[PDB]
Design a protein around this ligand. Structure first.
Ligand SMILES: [Ca+2]
Ligand SMILES: [Ca+2]
Ligand SMILES: [Ca+2]
Ligand SMILES: [Ca+2]
Ligand SMILES: [Ca+2]
Ligand SMILES: [Ca+2]
Ligand SMILES: [Ca+2]
Ligand SMILES: [Ca+2]
Ligand SMILES: [Ca+2]
Length: 313
DNA sequence: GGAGACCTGG
DNA sequence: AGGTCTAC
C-alpha cells in the first residue's frame, strides 16, 4: 500500500495531544537538526524513530502518528508505549509557550520575531547519528549533508523496510563505521576529506575511549566536561561539539557560534567583542559570543537560537 | 599563539 | 556551504 496518509488508512493512526504552538513539523524536521526526514506526502513526514519507521502529520490540536511494522507483524495503530518514544524524541515535556515567555520578557527583539515562528523546539537525537552527521557538516550545506548522510546510511546501515521506492535504513553502528576500507568506500560517496574523520572517530571511540558507553555517558556529565571530551575526537571542533551537546547530550545551554550568529549579534543586538582585540570571528571571540547569549537568554539559550535561526531564513 | 591544506558541487 | 587540523 506504500506510504500512508491520514485519509488513506484512518484505522492505523494514533493521536498525541499537541497544539501547533508547541510543535511545527515543517519547521524542525528539515531545519538542519536531523537529516533523515522526508515530506513524502504533503504535510506527511517519514523517518526512522526508535529503530522503526514512522509517518507523522499534525492537525490544529493533535499530532497523528503511525508506525510501520511490515509483514513481520499485523497492521495496527501505535501502542501507548510506542507513542512514548515519539514524545521523548520531541521532548514534549519541555513547554515552548513557557520558554517563549521567558525569552520575550528579557529580550525585546525576541518578541517581535518569535510571534510568527512558534513551534520551534529541539529534537533529542541519538549520540551516534548526531556525532557523525555533524562531522560531515564541515564546509557543507543542508542539502549536501542530507545527501551524504543518506548515502552513508544506505551503504552501512541495516535495512528496515521498503515503502514505495524507498528503502529505510537505520543508522550504522560503531563497528560498521570502524571496519576496514570504510574511508575509501565513503570517498566514492562524495564525502571528501570528511571520510577520514568518520573512520578515525569511529575507531578512536571503540579502540581508545571505552566504546559506545563512553559517548552515551556524556549525557550525565556537565556541558564543560562533555564539550572538552568531544573535542578529543578527530574532526570534532568547538562548533561540532556544541551541536552534539545541544542536540544529543541534553545541554540546552550550548550555543554553537558561527558567522550566522555573528550577523545576528551585530545587527539585532549591536554586539561587539570586549575581551579580545580581534574584531572578527576567532576562538577567543567565539567563546565570548556564546557566553553573551547564555547570559542574555539563560540556561536554554540553545533553544532560543533555534527560534532566531528559523526566523532569519 | 593567534594561515594555509583538505574534498566537491558548482 | 550548520569547519577542523597542522604549522609557525
Ligand atoms: Ca490521551
Ligand atoms: Ca539503536
Ligand atoms: Ca535510508
Ligand atoms: Ca564551552
Ligand atoms: Ca578534535
Ligand atoms: Ca576546544
Ligand atoms: Ca533592535
Ligand atoms: Ca560561506
Ligand atoms: Ca547556521
Amino acid at each position: 500500500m506504500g506510504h500512508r496518509t491520514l485519509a488513506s488508512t484512518p484505522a492505523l493512526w494514533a493521536s498525541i495531544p499537541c497544539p501547533r504552538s508547541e510543535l511545527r513539523l515543517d519547521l524542525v524536521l528539515p531545519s538542519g537538526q536531523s537529516f533523515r526526514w522526508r515530506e513524502q506526502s504533503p504535510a506527511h513526514w517519514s523517518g526512522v524513530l526508535a529503530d522503526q519507521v514512522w509517518t507523522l502529520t499534525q492537525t490544529e490540536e493533535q499530532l497523528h502518528c503511525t508506525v510501520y511494522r511490515g509483514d513481520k507483524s499485523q497492521a495496527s495503530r501505535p501502542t501507548p508505549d510506542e507513542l512514548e518514544a515519539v514524545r521523548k524524541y520531541f521532548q514534549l515535556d519541555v513547554t515552548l509557550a513557557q520558554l517563549y515567555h521567558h525569552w520575550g520578557s528579557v529580550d525585546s527583539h525576541f518578541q517581535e520575531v518569535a510571534q510568527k515562528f512558534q513551534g520551534v523546539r529541539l529534537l533529542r537525537q541519538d549520540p551516534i547519528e548526531c556525532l557523525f552527521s555533524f562531522i560531515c557538516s564541515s564546509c557543507n550545506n543542508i542539502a549536501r549533508i542530507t545527501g551524504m548522510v543518506e548515502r552513508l546510511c544506505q551503504a552501512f546501515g541495516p535495512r528496515l523496510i521498503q515503502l514505495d521506492d524507498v528503502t529505510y535504513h537505520g543508522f550504522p553502528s560503531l563497528q560498521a563505521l570502524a571496519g576496514p576500507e570504510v574511508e575509501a568506500h565513503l570517498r566514492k560517496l562524495g564525502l571528501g576529506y570528511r571520510a577520514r574523520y568518520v573512520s578515525a572517530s569511529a575507531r578512536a571511540i571503540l579502540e581508545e575511549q571505552g566504546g559506545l558507553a563512553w559517548l552515551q555517558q556524556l549525557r550525565e556529565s556537565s556541558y564543560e566536561e562533555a564539550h572538552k571530551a568531544l573535542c578529543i575526537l578527530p574532526g570534532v571542533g568547538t562548533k561540532v561539539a556544541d551541536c552534539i551537546c545541544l542536540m544529543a547530550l541534553d545541554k540546552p545551554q550550548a550555543v554553537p557560534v558561527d558567522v550566522h550568529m555573528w550577523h545576528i549579534a551585530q545587527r539585532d543586538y549591536s554586539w561587539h567583542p570586549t575581551t579580545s582585540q580581534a574584531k572578527g570571528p576567532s576562538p577567543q571571540t567565539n567563546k565570548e559570543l556564546g557566553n553573551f547569549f547564555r547570559s542574555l537568554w539563560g540556561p536554554y539559550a540553545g533553544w532560543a537560537q533555534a527560534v532566531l535561526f528559523s526566523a532569519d531564513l
